Amino acid sequence: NCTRPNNMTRKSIRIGPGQAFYALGDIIGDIRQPHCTVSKATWNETLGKVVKQ
Amino acid sequence: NITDDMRGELKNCSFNMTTELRDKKQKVYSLFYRLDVVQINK
Amino acid sequence: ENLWVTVYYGVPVWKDAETTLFCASDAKAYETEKHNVWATHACVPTDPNPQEIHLENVTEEFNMWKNNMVEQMHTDIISLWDQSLKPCVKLTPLCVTLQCTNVTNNITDDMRGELKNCSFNMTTELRDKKQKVYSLFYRLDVVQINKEYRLINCNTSACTQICPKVSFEPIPIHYCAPAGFAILKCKDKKFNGTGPCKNVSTVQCTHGIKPVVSTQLLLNGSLAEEEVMIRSENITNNAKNIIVQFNTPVQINCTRPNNMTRKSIRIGPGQAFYALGDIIGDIRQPHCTVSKATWNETLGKVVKQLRKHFGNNTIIFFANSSGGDLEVTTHSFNCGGEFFYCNTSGLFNSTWISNSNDSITLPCRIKQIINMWQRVGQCMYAPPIQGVIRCVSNITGLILTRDGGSTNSTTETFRPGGGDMRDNWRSELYKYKVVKIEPLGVAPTRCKRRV
Ligand SMILES: *[C@@H]1O[C@H](CO)[C@@H](O[C@@H]2O[C@H](CO)[C@@H](O[C@@H]3O[C@H](CO[C@H]4O[C@H](CO)[C@@H](O)[C@H](O)[C@@H]4O)[C@@H](O)[C@H](O[C@H]4O[C@H](CO)[C@@H](O)[C@H](O)[C@@H]4O[C@H]4O[C@H](CO)[C@@H](O)[C@H](O)[C@@H]4O)[C@@H]3O)[C@H](O)[C@H]2NC(C)=O)[C@H](O)[C@H]1NC(C)=O
Ligand SMILES: *[C@@H]1O[C@H](CO)[C@@H](O[C@@H]2O[C@H](CO)[C@@H](O[C@@H]3O[C@H](CO[C@H]4O[C@H](CO)[C@@H](O)[C@H](O)[C@@H]4O)[C@@H](O)[C@H](O[C@H]4O[C@H](CO)[C@@H](O)[C@H](O)[C@@H]4O)[C@@H]3O)[C@H](O)[C@H]2NC(C)=O)[C@H](O)[C@H]1NC(C)=O
Ligand SMILES: *[C@@H]1O[C@H](CO)[C@@H](O[C@@H]2O[C@H](CO)[C@@H](O[C@@H]3O[C@H](CO[C@H]4O[C@H](CO)[C@@H](O)[C@H](O)[C@@H]4O)[C@@H](O)[C@H](O[C@H]4O[C@H](CO)[C@@H](O)[C@H](O)[C@@H]4O)[C@@H]3O)[C@H](O)[C@H]2NC(C)=O)[C@H](O)[C@H]1NC(C)=O
Ligand SMILES: *[C@@H]1O[C@H](CO)[C@@H](O[C@@H]2O[C@H](CO)[C@@H](O[C@@H]3O[C@H](CO[C@H]4O[C@H](CO)[C@@H](O)[C@H](O)[C@@H]4O)[C@@H](O)[C@H](O[C@H]4O[C@H](CO)[C@@H](O)[C@H](O)[C@@H]4O)[C@@H]3O)[C@H](O)[C@H]2NC(C)=O)[C@H](O)[C@H]1NC(C)=O
Ligand SMILES: *[C@@H]1O[C@H](CO)[C@@H](O[C@@H]2O[C@H](CO)[C@@H](O[C@@H]3O[C@H](CO)[C@@H](O)[C@H](O)[C@@H]3O)[C@H](O)[C@H]2NC(C)=O)[C@H](O)[C@H]1NC(C)=O
Ligand SMILES: *[C@@H]1O[C@H](CO)[C@@H](O[C@@H]2O[C@H](CO)[C@@H](O[C@@H]3O[C@H](CO)[C@@H](O)[C@H](O)[C@@H]3O)[C@H](O)[C@H]2NC(C)=O)[C@H](O)[C@H]1NC(C)=O
Ligand SMILES: *[C@@H]1O[C@H](CO)[C@@H](O[C@@H]2O[C@H](CO)[C@@H](O[C@@H]3O[C@H](CO)[C@@H](O)[C@H](O)[C@@H]3O)[C@H](O)[C@H]2NC(C)=O)[C@H](O)[C@H]1NC(C)=O
Ligand SMILES: *[C@@H]1O[C@H](CO)[C@@H](O[C@@H]2O[C@H](CO)[C@@H](O)[C@H](O)[C@H]2NC(C)=O)[C@H](O)[C@H]1NC(C)=O
Ligand SMILES: *[C@@H]1O[C@H](CO)[C@@H](O[C@@H]2O[C@H](CO)[C@@H](O)[C@H](O)[C@H]2NC(C)=O)[C@H](O)[C@H]1NC(C)=O
Ligand SMILES: *[C@@H]1O[C@H](CO)[C@@H](O[C@@H]2O[C@H](CO)[C@@H](O)[C@H](O)[C@H]2NC(C)=O)[C@H](O)[C@H]1NC(C)=O
Ligand SMILES: *[C@@H]1O[C@H](CO)[C@@H](O[C@@H]2O[C@H](CO)[C@@H](O)[C@H](O)[C@H]2NC(C)=O)[C@H](O)[C@H]1NC(C)=O
Ligand SMILES: *[C@@H]1O[C@H](CO)[C@@H](O[C@@H]2O[C@H](CO)[C@@H](O)[C@H](O)[C@H]2NC(C)=O)[C@H](O)[C@H]1NC(C)=O
Ligand SMILES: *[C@@H]1O[C@H](CO)[C@@H](O[C@@H]2O[C@H](CO)[C@@H](O)[C@H](O)[C@H]2NC(C)=O)[C@H](O)[C@H]1NC(C)=O
Ligand SMILES: *[C@@H]1O[C@H](CO)[C@@H](O[C@@H]2O[C@H](CO)[C@@H](O)[C@H](O)[C@H]2NC(C)=O)[C@H](O)[C@H]1NC(C)=O
Ligand SMILES: *[C@@H]1O[C@H](CO)[C@@H](O[C@@H]2O[C@H](CO)[C@@H](O)[C@H](O)[C@H]2NC(C)=O)[C@H](O)[C@H]1NC(C)=O
Ligand SMILES: *[C@@H]1O[C@H](CO)[C@@H](O[C@@H]2O[C@H](CO)[C@@H](O)[C@H](O)[C@H]2NC(C)=O)[C@H](O)[C@H]1NC(C)=O
Ligand SMILES: *[C@@H]1O[C@H](CO)[C@@H](O)[C@H](O)[C@H]1NC(C)=O
Hints:
It is classed as viral protein/antiviral protein,immune system. The entry lists the keywords complex, IMMUNE SYSTEM complex. Chains A, B, C: Envelope glycoprotein gp120. The organism of A, B, C is Human immunodeficiency virus 1. This is part of a larger assembly, with three copies of chain A. Chain A is α+β, with helices and mostly antiparallel strands. Helices cover 25% and strands 45% of the residues of chain A. Chain A has one helix at 40-52; strands at 2-3, 7-16, 19-28, 35-36. The longest helix of chain A has 13 residues, at 40-52. The first copy, chain A, starts with a strand and ends with a helix. Chains in contact: A-B, A-C, B-C. A molecule of 2 linked components (NAG-NAG) is lined by residues 259, 280, 387-388 of chain C.
């Protein structure tokens, strides 16, 4: 399970005729590190099987 | 309101940019990830 | 008796099908050397003596509203225009602030505020130098930013200037079928676009079709042979457009009387922008003219043909367009390279109840920034044409729309319509269909193979 918890806002900036650049406008709330999570037991079992092979 | 692990990861960068009119410039700002920018020499 | 299967290869059998036709043009275009898009990118020489074979005993079902020929022609013309515009100049630097004043030097009251004298700074062949230049812009091609103006397209896309060496004038185009396919043609005089045809032929190529781009009025097209023809996918559905084909043409004379000067401005290395320099003489409204009596007779014939579907006693109203943008609300066309949009309110302003050179005059406006095919983001800039412009064309048909009517059934009102060019192509391809040959047949005989 991977997540970016920061609530991000997309801002359009017109840089030319019909040319728009989509930037990060603001962060709503606190800023936290995006992270992934995996079960320890499942990963340990999978690694054990890999080692056995 | 950042955490200690996310310190310096995001940067608030202001710059002048072109507009739909070739003779006009707009001062804008954005947020850039630390990995996407490099110091030239603030 | 004893009968056995027998195989025949090359039997005259066919099925309805879709394929990719090719296009042919006469050698005359190759002799112009004006680089017509069709003759340059798509088409090949036309056969001096095209083959038409009349199919005796054959009765074939036609439907002009489900003909892939129209879709292929629409795609082809759009692609060819884009291809011709690819190598042309892109007017990105033209998107700058404009300081615009009026042009009041001998103008008429009707043309007040239509033209603007705009000064601006522009790039030169040297990247580090700027030149202060001026031009004349039509009121429709500019919009006020806040005396400060900008081109209408600057917030959508950059316009591509039409190369003056390229010609978009409509030359006849023939559509021809490849191997394994045939083009069937209905020669019935009173064919309404759908149903059986008893006088059928097969043709290598279609007749010369001129891809004329116009709205509210079909120009320089084919005429009906006996009477005015009304065609609609479903006449009782007011949401379906009605294509009207005339049996006699109506002459229309359109003119821009203003004597215009073309000025070249060097905006980059090898990049030239063609602007309107000055107007020589007085400024008058461009206009079109049609004979009142001829138009009245044509409208009477159209009403007579419509009463066959909407009643002998129903009152018929011809009113102007309801709403939309300039292309749909006006008769739009190209005259000598300039893009005209004419007010047709004087043409559809009539009442019919079922019971001399006044020369109806239609005021017209001109545009230089053109959005074709109802697209967005691919605007095109038309450079001005030097001198005085006059063109004469034939109205051969109409595109109409019927109002809901509220189901009262007492009256019916018709308004000019258009926009979708597919109807324009249908006005010419209604009599053609494409079929795929099935050359294998199996039949019983007394012939038995040897053992
Ligand atoms: C429905 O159908 C009708 C008839 O088919 C059609 O009207 C025709 O329109 C075309 C184009 O608008 C007309 O062709 C133009 O005619 C003008 C007038 O010149 C007359 O006199 C000369 C004298 O020799 C004749 O050769 C000529 O045939 C005319 O009788 C010409 O000046 C045009 O040529 C110039 O423009 C061409 C296109 O740009 C160039 O290829 C050509 O070399 C000429 O260049 C001139 O203009 C350039 C700028 O464009 C400039 O740079 C050059 O230096 C030069 O000044 C062109 O041949 C034709 O005459 C009309 N026919 C009739 C009977 O009216 C309708 O337009 C059509 N309706 C629709 C909606 O399509
Ligand atoms: C990245 O960097 C940019 C630029 O540095 C930051 O953008 C600035 O954000 C601040 C804070 O939001 C802005 O300052 C605030 O603007 C509010 C909006 O008011 C506008 O209109 C008034 C009236 O005309 C102007 O005076 C004002 O300048 C603004 O144009 C003001 O309401 C704020 O003041 C009031 O409210 C605060 C909060 O309640 C009070 O403390 C004050 O006393 C006062 O009552 C304040 O001035 C600033 O204008 C923004 N600049 C730009 C260029 O947009 C981003 O926030 C930053 N992002 C991150 C994530 O760091
Ligand atoms: C759209 O807008 C542009 C710019 O505003 C207009 O261009 C201007 O047109 C006016 C009128 O033609 C120009 O002014 C006239 O210029 C004539 C040319 O002389 C040139 O050389 C002399 C000598 O070096 C310079 O002094 C002068 O500035 C020019 O560079 C002059 O001869 C005119 O004055 C003389 O003649 C008139 C008429 O006979 C007399 O009344 C005077 O008293 C004097 O004897 C006059 O100065 C102007 O220079 C143009 N500007 C530019 C930038 O080109 C367009 O005309 C306008 N178009 C429309 C349709 O509105
Ligand atoms: C060419 O164009 C015409 C005009 O659009 C079409 O004629 C329409 O055909 C539709 C479909 O048959 C008609 O709608 C149906 O009408 C039936 C008759 O009811 C009449 O009276 C009621 C009174 O309340 C009106 O509401 C109704 O509009 C009719 O005037 C109804 O019984 C139908 O209802 C059933 O079907 C609908 C649609 O599936 C369901 O939603 C209902 O719940 C119900 O099961 C239906 O409303 C329409 O009235 C016709 N209009 C006219 C002007 O005649 C042609 O069909 C078309 N031809 C082709 C080949 O496409
Ligand atoms: C966007 O563009 C503007 C205009 O080019 C930039 O502002 C300009 O910044 C320069 C450098 O800071 C200023 O010149 C300096 O001025 C100071 C006095 O404040 C002087 O001591 C220095 O010697 C130098 O001359 C200039 O005046 C200023 N112009 C303005 C504000 O109109 C702006 O910095 C640009 N933005 C970004 C994000 O780069
Ligand atoms: C083409 O570019 C030139 C140069 O950029 C433009 O001229 C410049 O116009 C600005 C705005 O009018 C001038 O600045 C202003 O000057 C006045 C005094 O006249 C002052 O009161 C204002 O506060 C402001 O500073 C600038 O001086 C001027 N530069 C010149 C003439 O060299 C010109 O307007 C541009 N043309 C078009 C059609 O946009
Ligand atoms: C559509 O058709 C109607 C009816 O023909 C046009 O309205 C009519 O226009 C004529 C000519 O302008 C009017 O006659 C004028 O009457 C005034 C006042 O009596 C008189 O001073 C003039 O000398 C001229 O005789 C007529 O009254 C008027 N009728 C109505 C009911 O409005 C209408 O202009 C047409 N629309 C278009 C776009 O052609
Ligand atoms: C991310 O931020 C946006 C904007 O602040 C949030 O959108 C708001 O959602 C609430 C309901 O949760 C509404 O009442 C507000 O009107 C919304 N504001 C807008 C759309 O401007 C969004 O909910 C936030 N997402 C998370 C996961 O926190
Ligand atoms: C990854 O996310 C899923 C949900 O998308 C988590 O599944 C939930 O697990 C908890 C605890 O076992 C249950 O109570 C929920 O009913 C589950 N929801 C589901 C399956 O939709 C899963 O545990 C997460 N894995 C992690 C965080 O490692
Ligand atoms: C702005 O961000 C930069 C980059 O993270 C900060 O530079 C670091 O600051 C910390 C805290 O003082 C020092 O320990 C580091 O040595 C600095 N350099 C690096 C590469 O991390 C800077 O301090 C920040 N300034 C402010 C005012 O927030
Ligand atoms: C310059 O042109 C504009 C656009 O036509 C004029 O603006 C109009 O002027 C008339 C006459 O005074 C007014 O009745 C209108 O209300 C104005 N606006 C519009 C949208 O038409 C302007 O007057 C012209 N100025 C000069 C000096 O010629
Ligand atoms: C507009 O229609 C008229 C009348 O049909 C055309 O003039 C005729 O053109 C044919 C061409 O073969 C000549 O044979 C006739 O002699 C011409 N006159 C008449 C009275 O028929 C005219 O060419 C058409 N114009 C366009 C642009 O198609
Ligand atoms: C074109 O003509 C065909 C017949 O040649 C019309 O189709 C018939 O329409 C009537 C109703 O008006 C039906 O009762 C018949 O069953 C239809 N027969 C066939 C073979 O289609 C068609 O409606 C006409 N289209 C028009 C006038 O737009
Ligand atoms: C449009 O304007 C140009 C330029 O003023 C006119 O060209 C002139 O034509 C006359 C003959 O009519 C010549 O004597 C001049 O030498 C020409 N001047 C040039 C070419 O600069 C042209 O005649 C005008 N056209 C109309 C229809 O009025
Ligand atoms: C459209 O223009 C043509 C000429 O290009 C006009 O035809 C002329 O008509 C007048 C009056 O009937 C005749 O005297 C001329 O001999 C005709 N010239 C031709 C046919 O070359 C036609 O009348 C115009 N139609 C309008 C203005 O509605
Ligand atoms: C086309 O011409 C007609 C009549 O010549 C114009 O009709 C006028 O439209 C205005 C604007 O809606 C109405 O207030 C008037 O009632 C109409 N006057 C007449 C004479 O009927 C019409 O405006 C023109 N079309 C456009 C869009 O300019
Ligand atoms: C149609 O005519 C009416 C009345 O003259 C006018 O208000 C309307 O603007 C006209 N529509 C178009 C598209 O010209």
